[PDB]
Symmetry: D2
Subunit: 131 residues, 4 copies
């Protein structure tokens, strides 16, 4: 009762293109085989897929995920550091987006009235939107 | 004013590496060259650099940015519609991040004590939160 | 005929996550709904989606894409100028990878017979590639 | 040897903003500071910077790079395994970019003589072309 590529895609909500990709870089290869070849993914493949999705969610790259998955347990300490790292990346990003939003809402209020703007003048203003 | 690539890089907080790329793809070519090949940047180039920086900030692709920087004036709507859209993009990102951070707290709470974290167990547990 | 978000994900080679996101940021919202209260996509939505996919294939940002579609038709001259730009961007990336790969094989072959790969040294030899 | 943040930025061909960020996420922190508060980067910090760049150049992520730079040396078998995986990612991109350029050459040829590009029509030709050469 293995799955066709298209079935697996629907099941794990991944595009077929993304599956061919993961299979290609050897991050997730379908486990089954009939005769005359043929793909076919299994229920164990789904867990690994879900595993991959769990770590992308946390911000890890295919490289790290590959490393992680190639193990049963990855020892807390080192792992928490890994995840805590991704956390700092997120926090830094959270602060960055907050500012960008503020800069744009600001720029809008400043230029809404203008039918046209000098591209340069509209940059110098956005630039002075830092100390 | 005149800037040798390295001095230009430094004054615009951009790498010498980036400048060579903007030059290659023709996004920002130096207005002048030394007589021995070395490139020389002008104050104008500095504004073009400032501009590339500004619009990249607004979410514009490098291709659209070029077109914009090649016109003195432009219909204000081009920027207005863009920031408006990016605003929604960034708001969805804030939510997406606030959630991920929240999920990490949970993850830390559940395996902070263990000697090892079972990848399969970890993933299924995290999946619970989706 | 129409589709529910799941069947639409299949028709248009995309995911439900993607579709929900597009719905949230108002880049693509379903043209209809079922009495049950579910998203129900039209053949028209399917085409808008195809358009989003295209263009995104080019270095176009979501925001730029919405503008492209709403415009219905765009000036060929400027458009092909942006695509030719992206072409240079892609050719630069293509040659960049070519370099990275050969650098990869050099280092790979050099540290091949060592017991351990000293990170600091590895980096040192790589750097010395000029 | 010692570097202030600007001197250090110029040396590793990295921006000041990038250095502040690395500092913020604990990827690369100044090992010494000035009595007035300014960061003082060391020769040791200089090696870590170059390692970060060397692996960035190879396409590794910052997280991956942190794991790497946190351990002096790695077991050759495993190292190569990791290099090989990354080498595949690069081959995938190389191949993908080749199709894109190709797709763009076709589309350019198609609307080259048209005053306007009809979005919906364009999208149909691009999709038919991508699939046609599947």
């Amino acid at each position: 009762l293995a799955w066709l590529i298209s079935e697996f895609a629907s099941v794990g909500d991944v595009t077929v293109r993304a599956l061919r990709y993961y299979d290609k870089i050897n991050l997730l290869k379908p486990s089954d085989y009939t005769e005359g070849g043929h793909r076919l993914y299994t229920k164990d493949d789904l867990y690994v897929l879900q595993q991959i999705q769990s770590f992308k969610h946390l911000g890890f790259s295919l490289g790290e995920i590959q490393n992680i998955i190639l193990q049963r347990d990855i020892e807390t300490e080192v792992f928490l550091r890994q995840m805590h790292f991704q956390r700092e990346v997120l926090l830094a990003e959270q602060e960055r987006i907050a500012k960008v939003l503020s800069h744009m809402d600001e720029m809008t209020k400043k230029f809404q009235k203008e039918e046209r703007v000098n591209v340069a003048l509209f940059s110098s203003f956005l630039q002075t939107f830092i100390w």
